[PDB]
Design a binder for this molecule. Sequence first.
Ligand SMILES: *Cc1cc2c(cc1C)nc1c(=O)[nH]c(=O)nc-1n2C[C@H](O)[C@H](O)[C@H](O)COP(=O)(O)OP(=O)(O)OC[C@H]1O[C@@H](n2cnc3c(N)ncnc32)[C@H](O)[C@@H]1O
Ligand SMILES: *Cc1cc2c(cc1C)nc1c(=O)[nH]c(=O)nc-1n2C[C@H](O)[C@H](O)[C@H](O)COP(=O)(O)OP(=O)(O)OC[C@H]1O[C@@H](n2cnc3c(N)ncnc32)[C@H](O)[C@@H]1O
Ligand SMILES: CCCCCCCCCCCC[N+](C)(C)CCCS(=O)(=O)O
Ligand SMILES: CCCCCCCCCCCC[N+](C)(C)CCCS(=O)(=O)O
Ligand SMILES: c1ccc2oc(-c3ncc[nH]3)cc2c1
Ligand SMILES: c1ccc2oc(-c3ncc[nH]3)cc2c1
Lengths: 499, 494
Amino acid sequence: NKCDVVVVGGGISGMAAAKLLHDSGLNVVVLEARDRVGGRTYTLRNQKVKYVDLGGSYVGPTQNRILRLAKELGLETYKVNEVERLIHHVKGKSYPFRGPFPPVWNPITYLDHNNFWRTMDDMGREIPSDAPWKAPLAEEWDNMTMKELLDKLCWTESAKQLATLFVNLCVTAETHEVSALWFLWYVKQCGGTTRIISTTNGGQERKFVGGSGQVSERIMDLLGDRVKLERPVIYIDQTRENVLVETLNHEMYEAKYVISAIPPTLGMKIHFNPPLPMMRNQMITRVPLGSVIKCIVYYKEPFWRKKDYCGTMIIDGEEAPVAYTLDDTKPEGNYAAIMGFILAHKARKLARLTKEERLKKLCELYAKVLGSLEALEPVHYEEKNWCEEQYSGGCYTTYFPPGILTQYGRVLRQPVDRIYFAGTETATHWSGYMEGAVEAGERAAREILHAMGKIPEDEIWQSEPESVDVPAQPITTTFLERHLPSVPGLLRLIGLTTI
Amino acid sequence: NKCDVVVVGGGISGMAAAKLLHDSGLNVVVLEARDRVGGRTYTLRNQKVKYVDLGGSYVGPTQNRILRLAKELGLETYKVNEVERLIHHVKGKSYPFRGPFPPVWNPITYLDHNNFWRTMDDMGREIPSDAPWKAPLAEEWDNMTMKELLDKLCWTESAKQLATLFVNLCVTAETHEVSALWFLWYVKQCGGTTRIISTTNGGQERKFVGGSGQVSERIMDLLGDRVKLERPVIYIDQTRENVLVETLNHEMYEAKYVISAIPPTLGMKIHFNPPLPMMRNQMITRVPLGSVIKCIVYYKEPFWRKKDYCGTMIIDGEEAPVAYTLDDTKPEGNYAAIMGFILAHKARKLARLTKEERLKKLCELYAKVLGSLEALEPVHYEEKNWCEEQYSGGCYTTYFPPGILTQYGRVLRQPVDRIYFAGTETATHWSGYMEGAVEAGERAAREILHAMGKIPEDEIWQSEPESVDVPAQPITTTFLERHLPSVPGLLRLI
Ligand SMILES: *Cc1cc2c(cc1C)nc1c(=O)[nH]c(=O)nc-1n2C[C@H](O)[C@H](O)[C@H](O)COP(=O)(O)OP(=O)(O)OC[C@H]1O[C@@H](n2cnc3c(N)ncnc32)[C@H](O)[C@@H]1O
Ligand SMILES: *Cc1cc2c(cc1C)nc1c(=O)[nH]c(=O)nc-1n2C[C@H](O)[C@H](O)[C@H](O)COP(=O)(O)OP(=O)(O)OC[C@H]1O[C@@H](n2cnc3c(N)ncnc32)[C@H](O)[C@@H]1O
Ligand SMILES: CCCCCCCCCCCC[N+](C)(C)CCCS(=O)(=O)O
Ligand SMILES: CCCCCCCCCCCC[N+](C)(C)CCCS(=O)(=O)O
Ligand SMILES: c1ccc2oc(-c3ncc[nH]3)cc2c1
Ligand SMILES: c1ccc2oc(-c3ncc[nH]3)cc2c1
């Protein structure tokens, strides 16, 4: 009933906010719609898999907040398998490789690929992490889709196809669905193209031993009965001295302040009194989440390793249900498994099938890509289609269609009276990830501490010491990567020698 | 508590559905979130204006359902003034004209403009009104914005600027916000470019005497205490024998079936048990409504008529707050007024001003465009910013960003167990309009009558006889309009 702060949502962001407030001596309550905490993280436990992350799983260098929070809760990481070769499967054939990107041998195609990644990062440097609408060409870039930008930048079909797969995997959406400004912001605020796509030295380097759901569960353990499960919030009333928060199961909570720690569009599920200001009222109808089915196929052994494949497959082509896989074998070497994502329109297309039908298509694909009949012999299968979740809306995160980020982006984390906004979507570093959820939950909690006169303004945003366990190597380029011309740059050089 | 059908939403579509079900002898209840009926229609009455439509207002030929429904309820229409010349204001100068499109004189610009409109209608012919995702090029057209299509089709800036104004005024959204397939469908399902943009013989021909809010109000009068105001629906449970519908003010309604007659995205405000199917769960997060402030400036007389201007202005350019106006004077020549729309990004930009600051900007604009100091002497002002409305989400209607109509369009009308979907967004003719609200509410009602075994399947969708009061005249084209080449066409012959 009565408290200092109600936190709406018990995902990592709400849990990190509640913990900070609790540790600071305030009385907090977390109102969580589901019968569990964790939100877009979910660790399933059963005897066939031991444990498996069906939602968010990976962490890596530069994600220092989630690493610190998880360490403090007694959790450990291990490295995703990348010992053996990666595979790029394109036009029905597999090409093994090492390094962040498949090698390109054709010199023209090489210039085009090099220029594409370079230009993504060059554009990103123009876009402030905390205010992307302030980029010099924000309007021009927000008024085109990523499809339009790829059409302009890629002088080869090879580059355009790889770039397409890159966008679909990063943000679980099609290139024509998303704003170019927003996508360029999203990549830059994860540290750039190499950092976002990499396993070793990148976002996919590690997983938590025992699953990421432990982060939210262990914070629930610390907070005790302060976390109220099966309490979907339906109504927030700020017309009186204390804020009133009502739940679906007929309970009323009264607080000094509220943190909204849910995906922005899911604010639609709450009726507000007084009504939200115009810009937020419309913003929350303009910000969908992406579409993904996360699928894990189990085998007797990690047989791909014997063929010198690590289990990472980048798979192009419309017929392939899964465009990206990673080895999901336990660190002990047992419960061998391949994790794959069914992305964007394919999540919609293939949701029609049964579980058994999707397992069959995945095994047939993996058998072809790995050149291995053993892939047709799974021992177990788990999957989760995040598009079906009422209290998530999709995964991994919210995308912005053309025109929205410049017109409505300013209000995403703007307080509304005594409501402050957390959730990974409001982060400025690794927004969309477990890391961004921690950044945003703690920042929102500190906004409230500042409102209460407990901390000064300069303490609202707080830097994070680098993890000693997962240090980050710098992202570097070569002289030739920096200075080689693009294809039109080369054509201009050719024109000039002729003139 | 108990009834045959609960209708969620008391706009025109919910009211038309509830009236049809009531007239067939079912017990209906309408649950309306607001303290009023009418939704995206709203008629304000006061002594200064008598009455004024601050939401949807115009009706015209081919909109036979809304005309028949209003006539039955005792309403009359009058014609929007279009006796004198229209104005196109471009690069700071007014050019008066007659007919529905402004004249173009330069021969290259002429071919470009002619080809733009012609091509919009040619593309529309391949898009089924009841299934735009079945167009032969559905995916190609859905994956581009209208901005990308205009960049391809328009070889002149003049055409691109007017086409941009056209998109902004039709769907209160920017060309780069909307799918080309969806926008092309939207125009075709209103009868094409001439029909949607025209006052005489088009969508804006008429208004209702006393205001369009009277349609919802008079159905509420018929239904009496069956209409429950200040009952926002929060929860719908379909796990039991009868459907259970819960409101924010802690009431529970039990029915055999439910009609959802709210904008699609506003289904987000309801918690569902069991959860919605995947495709609808995601669809209702992908379908925003547009942005508009409707503004009405009143004057002592309709002074523009003395200069042989009817009050219609098409005003190009970024600086102008209002890109389109119509004369809003009453049929008797009194309560002289100009109605203008502040569209799309300008609604967002100018919402930060005060009401008095917006009034000054509009009057100065109108003084320039009408070439009249009389425009600087307003006697009254009313406006409504629809972006502020929790229970509308915007106006006039829902738009589809690129990629969404092909991936999710099929779900809009699909029943979910015993919930059927009305609302103008689900119509197949004049979706977005009061006409579409009536088509969809009556079709959803007849889906339920069919589920109850009261009518056969072939009576779910019903034709509408043409209005005797507002007959349609044919849309025609000239030989030259049909056959003049495009710009790249003339370049092939060169
Ligand atoms: C789904 C997914 C996500 C994901 C990913 C793969 C998939 C399939 N891969 C990731 C990865 O490897 N590494 C990483 O860091 N992130 C990746 N993600 C994204 C990650 O899971 C999310 O960024 C993160 O979990 C988001 O956390 P946040 O706390 O911001 O949001 P949430 O988890 O959605 O939590 C919101 C909670 O709110 C409850 N809710 C919703 N509505 C209400 C109402 N009305 N009332 C009360 N509670 C509400 C939700 O139930 C949820 O618990
Ligand atoms: C806003 C606007 C609309 C408009 C226009 C100009 C403006 C500024 N110009 C028009 C015109 O000249 N001619 C025309 O035919 N239409 C034009 N429009 C659009 C027109 O107003 C709309 O197409 C039509 O009114 C839509 O009717 P519909 O019945 O489909 O939808 P609605 O009016 O939005 O009604 C929905 C009702 O539902 C209530 N609601 C919302 N959520 C809930 C919940 N959770 N529970 C219960 N009730 C709910 C809303 O309050 C509303 O009354
Ligand atoms: C007789 C000589 C004519 C040769 C002129 C060549 C025509 C150039 C067309 C190639 C388009 C390439 N893409 C990548 C699709 C678009 C680039 C965008 S941008 O042009 O760089 O702005
Ligand atoms: C001897 C040199 C001849 C000069 C010819 C120059 C022509 C360049 C202008 C083309 C741009 C026109 N837009 C409308 C933007 C694109 C058309 C779309 S599409 O080309 O039909 O795809
Ligand atoms: C496009 C789409 C998916 C991709 O995954 C990588 C990658 N995985 C591990 C190192 N680089 C690179 C890459 C490029
Ligand atoms: C672009 C934008 C707005 C427009 O309004 C008309 C119009 N109004 C009455 C007859 N034609 C034509 C037109 C073209």
